[PDB]
Write an enzyme that holds these catalytic residues in place. Structure first.
Site: not given
Ligand code: 6NQ
Ligand code: 6NQ
Ligand code: MG
Ligand code: MG
Lengths: 873, 873
Positions: B26, B96, B105, B107, B339, B457, B766, B833, B853
C-alpha cells in the site's frame, strides 16, 4: 588366400564353437561337438565368406573354392573308407544350409546325396531293397525340388497316381517293386518339367547343391525376413556337408535314442531304447518295438562303451542332461543329434541338485535349471508313473495349466456343476469356453478343449485357479449335442486322465499321488531363498489362509482384503447387510458395532498366525453386487427386510440409490472411508485392539494399515488423519502404544503420475496391478471377455494383460511411481499385491525396477520365490 | 544515515511505485497515486527497514526514527493547516500496516487517531455531536483492541449492556447523548482490563500505534503464514499514516463514488453519486438518498473540475476504467480509493474497443480486458436495464452460470418437469441439488440454491448447459414441505428473476433481450481471431448443429459422434435396434443396409454445411443403455420384439448377453469395430459415398476418419486396414479418388504412455479428456456424483475434474502423448474434443503444450476463441 572349407570329425575340427559368424549356427555347433571328442560322422563346412564371394562372382563358385571342397571330400572319404559314386562302398552325404542365426527362406536339408542306379543297387545289398528304392525316390523328390526348383507336387502327383492305381492309402504299403518303378517316374519328372535329366554323378549333384544353398540366401523369402527385422551385416549362409550313416546295414548296426539321465525321476542312469538293423523312423512309426539300452551293452560292447564315453563328454561340456540320437553302423557308434533333454518337474530338481553335489554346476546355474513350470508340477497332484500310461495316451494338446486330474467326462458346464454337488470328480470337455460358464469350470477337476491355446479362456482361468487344463488339442472333435469325442468314440461318463503339464490326455482311471516334499526340493528352494532379492508376502484374508501362506514360505502378508472377511457365516453377512442399508447414522454406527467383534477376532488370528512377520491390512474396498442375493428383485428385497427390518418401500429405494453404472470406478475404495469415516474408525479400532491383545500374549505384531484406490494425496491424508486419531484412543484405552506403519495402494493412474506428492504422505506403496491394468487399458475385468479372445487371436494382444504385466504401458506407471516415490521419500517401501505378483515374467520386471517385495496367493508363493531368484542370476 | 520515512501528498511523493520492498504494497501504491498527481490526503510511510531495526533494537524505536517521523507529521500538519491535538483545527490520522505482499495476521487499520475529549468537542462543532461521539467510541474500541491488546468483546459488552438497558436493537438508534455516556464506559475498560488509562496525547497514541504495527509483524498469526508458504527474505511491515478527511463537515463538503465510465454500457461518461454533508456509510446504509454527479458540478464547481482532472489522470496512468471513492471536505477534493471497476459483459467490450480507438491501449491489452465470463454474458439472454431493477434486488448469491432467466418458482424437480411440459418458464429453487434430479434441472429456465458454491452440483451442471444459475445464496432458507423462501415470504408460483452473471436474484417479472451483435463485439472478436494460435473446431453431429457452429466461428469439426446420429426419428432407432439384437451375420448385415442411407444423408449435409473446412468423423462408440426403452424388463422386451420380430425367448437372452457391469470400460469404442468389421465398413462407406457426392456438386470436402478408445497401435492398425479397403471400393465404384486422413482418439492412458507407437500409424491425435479423466482418476462420470461434493467441500479436489482439466495428472498424459507423437511423426496433428476443449484454463494449457486445435460445443466456440487469444498475450 583365405580358408573357406573347414572339415570336422571325431576329435578333429578345423573350426571351433565361437565361429558362428563364419561357419553359421549349425556349422559352429558341428565344430563344437567334434572338438570335444563326440562321435559325429565326418564332414565339412563351406564358410559364409564363400557365399559372399559366390554373390560377388555372379553366382558362380569363386576361384579355387571347388578344389578346396574336393580336398575336404577326400578327408571324409578317407575317414570312412568310402567314396562318392562307388557302388561297393558309396559315400552318401547330407547337405544343410545354416547362417549365423535362425533364418527362414533358407534351403531345406537334402539327404542321401550321391545316389544313382548303380549306387542304389549296391545299397540294396546291405539294406532292404525297399529302403534303397524308398531312399532313392525321396532324394529325387528333395533334390529335384530343393536344388532343381521342381515343385514337390509334381513328384507327389506321380506318387498318388500309383497309390490310387494300386489301390492303397498309405505309402508304407507300396512294395519295393512299386518303389523301383516309382523311381523311374520321378526321374522322368526331371525331363518333363525341366528338359534336364537327373544328374547321376555325385560330384555334379554336390556342385549344384552348393549353388542352391548360396542361392537360397539371396531368395525373396530370405530377403523379406532380413529387411523386416532391420538386421544388417551378414555375408551369407554356410554349407554343411556331412556323411550319412545308417542303422539298417545288418546285425552289426542299429539306431537308438536316450536321455543321459532319467527324464521322469532324474536318476543318473542312461535312459533310452535301441533297435538293431533299423532306422529312427521304424522306432517312432511303430512298425517294430525297441529294446532297453542294456541289450546294446551285451551284444555290441565296444559300441556301447563309446556311447557311454560320448555321454560323459556331453554332460561334462554342456553341463546338463542331454537328449541324444545315435546310430551304430557296422559296429561304429555315430552321434547324430544332441539337445538339452526335456524333464519333468520332479526330474528337474533331482538333476539340478545332483549336478551341484557332483560339482558339475554351481547353485546359481542350478536355480535356472528348474523352470517355474517344473516347480509348479511339484506343487500339484501328479501321476505316479508318467511312462506306465505311455501306451494309453490318445492325444497330446497344449500344457495350459500344470497339474493332473482324473474324472468322468461331461460335455457342458451346468452338468459339470450337477456332477460336483453329487460327490464325483468331473472332467469338463468343450470345443472352446467363454466367461458364460466360469462356475461350471470351478467344479470340474480337469478341463480339456479342442480349439484353444496358451491364451485361451480355458487356459487363463485354469491357471488362475491352479486347475489342471489341456487346451487346443486339434485331434478331438467335440459334439455337444451328440456327446462323443472322436480322437475311438469316447462316451460321456467314461474315466479320462489329463496331464496339464505335458498336454497329454490319457484313457481311463490313472493313479494319482499327492504333492510331497523331498530333500532335493527342500535343498533347491533354500538356494533360491538365499540368492533371492525380493521378499515374498502373501494375499491372505483368513487365519487358516495366513497359515497356508507361511507354510509355503510367505515372509508376511502384503494384502489382507478386509471386504473378503465376511463370507464364512450368515451372521457376518447379515451384519454387513445391516450397514449397507443403513440411512440413520445411529443405525450405521449400530451396524458397525455389530461388526467390530468379527473384525477384531479375525485380525487377532491373523496376527497370531503371522507371529513376527509384517501384516498389511487394507481398508474396505467392497464389491456390493457380491453381497446381495440371487433371484428376482421380488425375491432379493424380501431377504434384505428379513435381516434389516427396514420398511419394504424403504429397502426398495435404497437399492435404487446404491446401484451404479460402473461400480469398478464408482463408490468404492477410499471414497467410502472418506464419505463415511465411521467405517474406517471401526476397522482401525479392530486392528489396534487386536494388535495390543496379541502383543500382550507375547505375539510380535508388525501391523501396516493401507488406503485403497487413492488418486490424490488429499484422499490419503484424510484416512491417515482418521487412523492416527483412533490409534491414540485405543493406545490410551488399553494402556499400550504400538508402533505401526500407514501406506497407500497405487492402483489408479493419477497416483503414479503424481507419486512424489503421495510419497511425502505414505510410508509405503503397493501396486494394485489389477485395477491399474483395468484403468490403464480401459478394460473392465468382468466384461473384458466379450472381446479379449478376438484381440489375442488377431495379434492385437500377446497375453491376457490381467495375467502378464504390460511392461510398456502398465509397467511405465509402476517404474514411474517407484522412481518418484523413492526420490521424495528414501524410507519408502514398495511392493505389489495384484495377481501379477505371482507371475514369473512380472516378478522379473519388479526386481528390475527395484521393488522391495511382491505378494500373491498362498499357493503361488513358492513360484514367486523361484522367480525372484532366477531374475538375479 | 538512511531514510526511513517517506511523505506523500498531491503531486509530491518521496517514494515511487516500484518501491514495494521498502514501503510495502500500500505504501508504494500511495506513492504512485501521489506521484501522478491524484488528490490523496497527505501522509507518510515508515519503511520496512525501520521495522527491522525496531526488531534488532529489542522492539524499541530505533535511533532518530521518531524525530524522522515528527518531521513528516510537520509536513502533513502544514499541508492541511491542522495539528495533532488542536481542538480548533485538529489533525486526525489513519494508521495502516502493509508489507511487500498480502499478509494475514497483520495489524488492522486504525482510524481517527488523535481524538480525545477536547478534540472530539471541537469536532462536534463541525459534524453532528452524534458523529463525533460515535467516532470516539470506535477509536477507543479499535485503539484499545488493535494497539492496547484489549479484547474487542470487552467494549462490545458495554455496548450491548446499554442497548439492552435502553431497549433497542440497532446501534443507529442510540442517541448522541447515549454515545457520549458510552464513550466514558469505553475509557473505563482501559482501566478495568489493563490498569492503564486511554492515552489522550495524540503523539503518545501514534508512538504506541507505530510499535503495534511493527509488533504485529512478529506475531504468531504472521509467523504461522510465512513459515507455511516458505517465504524468506522479508524485513518487516511498513507503517502508512495518512490524514483523515470527512464529507460531513458542512455544506461545503460531501462524499461520493463513481466509475470513470458507465459499468453497464461502457459510455465514456463519469457515472456515480454524490451526497452533501455525509459519509460513505450514510450512502450504502440507506439513511439518505444520493444524487447524480451532475449536482456536484453545479454547486461545487472547483471541486468537480479537480475530480474530472483526477479521473483523467487515473485512466491515463492505469489505462483502464476505475471505480473510485472521493470526498470533498470544505471545498477540497480528496481521493480515497481507486480500483479497476467491475463491468458488465457489454460494458467490457465497449470500454475495451473505445480505449483502443482512443489509442490508450493496444489490441493485445484489450483482449485481456474482456474476461471469458464477460463474453459469456453476451452469448446469453440479458436484462434490458441492469440498474432499473436495483430497487427490486432481494439478495445476491454467487454467479454460478452466466445468463438471465425469469419464471415462476417451484420447489421440486418433478414439478419443474411438470411445468415445462405445460408451456411455462420454471425457476427451480432448492436448498441444494444432487444428480437425482438432472432431468428437472434440464426443464427449469433458471436455478437458485441456498447452500452451494462455484463447484456445487447446481453450478457445474448449469454451466455445462449454459443454463442460468445462482448458487450459494445464504440469505434464502428454502422449505421444501412448506414452499416458501424467507429472504419476505416468497410463495410458490410467483415470478422471480435471476442474474447468473452478477449472482443477483430479483423480485418479479423482468425485461429480457436476446443476444445481439454489435460493431464493438464484432471488432473485438476479430482481434482475438488474428492473435489466436489454436484453431477452434466444433463438436457437431447434425447438419443444423454444424451450421450453428460455423455461425459461431468454428473452423471445422473436430468430433462428429456417429453414435448420436440416430435420435431424430423412430425409423432410425428401430434401425439401430435391428443391429444390436442381430445374431445372424445375415441379419447383422441386413440391419447395416437399413442404416447406410441414414449415415450417408447425414454426412452429406454435414459436409455441405462445413463446405471447405475439415470434418473429423468418429467411428461408433455407442452407449447401449441409452438406446433401450424405459419401464419393467416386461414392458421393455415387448418393444424390442415389436421392432425386431425376434422370438421373445431369443430377445430375452440377448439382453442378458449384452448387459455389462462396467460399460464405460466394456464393449465399446474400437472394440466394436474390431469385433464387427461390418459395422466399420458400413460407416466408412457412407462417409466416402457422401464425400464423393458432395465433391461432385462443387463442395470442398476435407474428411478425417477417427478410431475411438484406442489403447494399442494394433487396434488402430486394424480399423485403418478396414478403412483403406473400403476407400478403394467406393473410389472405384464411383470413379473418383478423394484425399482423406485417418487418425485416432487418445482417451485411454495406455495410448499416451506408448504414443510413439501410435503416432507412426496415425495422422492425428485428439485427446478425449472425458474418458481420459475418467480412466486417470478412476471416476465414473455417471456415478462420481455419489462422492464428488464430499471431496470438493473437504478440499480433496479444487474443481470438478471433468470440467477443469487436471494439469498435474491428466495434463501429464496429454503433454506426454503430444511430445512423443510429434517426435515420432512430425506431420502429426493434435487436437481435443473433450469438454475441457471449451474451458478457458484448459485451453491455456493446450496452447502451452503446443496443440494444433481445440474442439467444443457450438455455443462454446466463441469463448474458446477468446481463451485461445488471451493465452498468447
Ligand atoms: N549325417 C547324417 N546321418 C544320418 N541322418 C542324418 C544325418 N544328417 C542329418 N540326418 C537326419 O536328417 C534329418 C534332418 O536333419 P536336420 O539337421 O535338419 O535335423 P533337425 O535338427 O531335426 N532340424 P534343423 O532345425 O534344421 O536342425 C534328421 O532326422 C537328421 Br538325424
Ligand atoms: N485518510 C482517510 N480518510 C478517510 N477515510 C479513510 C482514510 N484512510 C482510510 N479510510 C477509510 O477507512 C476504511 C479502511 O481503510 P483501508 O485502507 O483498510 O480500506 P480497504 O481498501 O477497504 N481494505 P484493505 O485491503 O486493508 O486496503 C475504508 O473505508 C477507507 Br476509504
Ligand atoms: Mg483394488
Ligand atoms: Mg470417448
Amino acid at each position: 588366400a583365405k580358408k573357406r572349407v573347414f572339415t570336422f570329425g571325431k576329435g578333429r575340427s578345423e573350426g571351433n564353437k565361437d565361429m558362428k559368424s563364419l561357419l553359421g549356427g549349425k556349422g559352429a555347433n558341428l565344430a563344437e561337438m567334434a572338438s570335444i571328442g563326440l562321435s559325429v560322422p565326418p564332414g565339412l563346412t563351406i564358410s559364409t565368406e564363400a557365399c559372399e564371394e559366390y554373390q560377388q562372382n555372379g553366382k558362380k563358385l569363386p576361384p579355387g573354392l571347388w578344389d578346396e571342397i574336393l580336398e575336404g571330400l577326400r578327408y571324409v572319404q578317407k575317414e570312412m573308407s568310402a567314396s562318392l559314386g562307388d557302388p561297393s562302398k558309396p559315400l552318401l552325404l547330407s547337405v544343410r544350409s545354416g547362417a549365423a542365426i535362425s533364418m527362414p527362406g533358407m534351403m531345406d536339408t537334402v539327404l542321401n546325396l550321391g545316389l544313382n542306379d548303380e549306387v542304389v543297387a549296391g545299397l540294396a545289398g546291405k539294406s532292404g531293397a525297399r529302403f534303397a528304392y524308398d531312399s532313392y525316390r525321396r532324394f529325387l523328390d528333395m533334390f529335384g525340388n530343393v536344388v532343381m526348383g521342381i515343385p514337390h507336387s509334381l513328384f507327389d502327383e506321380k506318387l498318388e497316381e500309383m497309390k490310387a492305381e494300386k489301390g492303397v492309402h498309405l505309402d508304407t504299403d507300396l512294395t519295393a517293386a512299386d518303389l523301383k518303378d516309382l523311381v523311374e517316374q520321378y526321374k522322368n519328372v526331371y525331363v518333363e518339367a525341366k528338359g534336364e535329366k537327373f544328374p547321376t554323378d555325385p560330384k555334379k549333384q554336390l556342385e549344384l547343391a552348393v549353388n542352391a544353398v548360396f542361392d537360397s540366401w539371396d531368395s525373396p523369402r530370405a530377403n523379406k525376413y532380413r529387411s523386416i527385422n532391420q538386421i544388417t551385416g551378414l555375408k551369407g549362409t554356410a554349407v554343411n556337408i556331412q556323411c550319412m550313416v545308417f542303422g539298417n546295414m545288418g546285425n552289426t548296426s542299429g539306431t537308438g535314442v536316450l536321455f543321459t539321465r532319467n527324464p521322469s525321476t532324474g536318476e543318473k542312469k542312461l535312459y533310452g531304447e535301441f533297435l538293431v538293423n533299423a532306422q529312427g523312423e521304424d522306432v517312432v512309426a511303430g512298425i517294430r518295438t525297441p529294446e532297453d539300452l542294456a541289450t546294446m551293452e551285451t551284444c555290441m560292447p565296444e559300441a556301447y562303451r563309446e556311447l557311454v564315453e560320448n555321454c560323459k563328454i556331453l554332460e561334462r561340456h554342456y553341463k546338463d542332461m542331454m537328449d541324444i540320437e545315435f546310430t551304430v553302423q557296422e559296429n561304429r557308434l555315430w552321434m547324430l543329434q544332441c539337445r538339452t533333454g526335456k524333464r519333468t518337474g520332479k526330474g528337474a530338481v533331482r538333476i539340478a541338485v545332483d549336478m551341484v553335489n557332483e560339482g558339475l554346476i554351481d547353485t546359481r546355474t542350478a536355480i535356472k535349471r528348474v523352470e517355474t513350470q517344473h516347480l509348479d508340477q511339484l506343487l500339484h497332484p501328479q501321476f505316479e508313473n508318467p511312462s506306465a500310461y505311455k501306451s494309453h495316451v490318445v492325444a497330446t494338446g497344449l500344457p495350459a495349466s500344470p497339474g493332473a486330474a482324473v474324472g468322468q467326462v461331461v460335455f457342458s458346464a451346468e452338468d459339470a456343476e450337477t456332477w460336483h454337488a453329487q460327490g464325483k470328480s468331473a472332467i469338463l470337455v468343450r470345443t472352446e469356453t467363454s466367461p458364460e460358464d466360469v462356475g461350471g469350470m470351478h467344479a470340474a477337476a480337469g478341463i480339456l478343449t479342442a480349439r484353444g491355446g496358451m491364451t485361451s479362456h480355458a487356459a487363463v482361468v485354469a491357471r488362475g485357479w491352479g486347475k489342471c487344463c489341456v487346451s487346443g488339442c486339434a485331434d478331438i472333435r467335440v459334439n455337444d449335442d451328440m456327446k462323443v469325442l472322436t480322437i475311438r468314440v469316447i462316451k460321456e461318463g467314461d474315466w479320462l486322465s489329463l496331464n496339464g503339464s505335458t498336454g497329454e490326455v490319457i484313457l481311463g482311471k490313472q493313479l494319482l499321488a499327492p504333492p510331497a516334499m523331498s530333500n532335493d526340493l527342500e535343498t533347491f528352494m533354500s538356494w533360491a531363498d538365499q540368492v533371492r532379492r525380493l521378499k515374498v508376502m502373501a494375499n491372505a484374508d483368513t487365519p487358516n489362509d495366513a497359515l497356508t501362506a507361511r507354510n509355503n514360505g510367505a515372509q508376511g502378508i502384503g494384502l489382507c482384503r478386509t471386504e473378503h472377511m465376511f463370507f464364512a457365516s450368515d451372521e457376518r453377512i447379515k451384519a454387513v447387510r445391516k450397514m449397507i442399508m443403513a440411512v440413520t447414522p445411529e443405525q450405521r454406527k449400530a451396524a458397525l458395532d455389530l461388526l467390530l467383534p468379527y473384525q477384531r477376532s479375525d485380525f487377532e488370528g491373523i496376527f497370531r498366525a503371522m507371529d513376527g512377520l509384517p501384516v498389511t491390512i487394507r481398508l474396505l474396498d467392497p464389491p456390493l453386487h457380491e453381497f446381495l442375493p440371487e433371484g428376482d428383485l421380488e425375491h432379493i428385497v424380501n431377504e434384505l427386510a428379513v435381516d434389516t427390518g427396514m420398511s419394504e418401500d424403504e429397502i426398495y429405494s435404497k437399492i435404487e440409490k446404491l446401484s451404479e453404472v460402473n461400480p469398478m470406478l464408482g463408490f468404492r475404495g477410499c471414497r467410502l472411508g472418506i464419505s463415511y469415516p465411521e467405517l474406517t474408525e471401526m476397522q482401525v479400532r479392530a486392528i489396534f485392539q487386536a494388535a495390543v491383545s496379541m502383543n500382550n500374549q507375547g505375539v510380535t505384531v508388525i501391523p501396516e494399515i493401507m488406503v485403497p484406490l487413492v488418486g490424490t494425496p488429499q484422499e490419503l491424508r484424510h484416512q491417515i488423519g482418521v487412523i492416527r486419531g483412533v490409534a491414540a484412543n485405543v493406545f490410551a484405552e488399553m494402556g499400550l502404544t504400538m508402533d505401526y506403519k500407514v501406506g497407500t495402494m497405487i492402483e489408479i493412474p493419477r497416483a503414479a503420475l503424481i507419486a512424489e506428492e503421495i510419497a511425502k504422505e505414505a510410508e509405503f506403496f503397493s501396486f494394485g496391478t489389477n485395477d491399474l491394468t483395468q484403468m490403464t487399458f480401459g478394460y473392465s475385468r468382468d466384461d473384458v471377455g466379450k472381446f479379449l479372445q478376438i484381440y489375442l487371436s488377431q495379434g492385437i494382444l500377446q497375453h491376457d494383460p490381467f495375467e502378464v504385466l504390460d511392461q510398456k504401458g502398465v509397467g511405465q506407471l509402476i517404474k514411474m511411481a517407484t522412481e518418484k516415490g523413492r526420490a521424495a521419500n528414501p524410507n519408502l517401501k514398495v511392493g505389489i499385491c495384484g495377481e501379477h505378483g505371482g507371475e514369473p515374467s512380472s516378478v522379473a520386471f519388479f526386481d528390475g525396477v527395484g521393488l522391495d517385495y511382491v505378494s500373491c496367493s498362498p499357493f503361488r508363493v513358492p513360484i514367486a520365490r523361484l522367480a525372484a531368484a532366477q531374475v538375479v542370476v
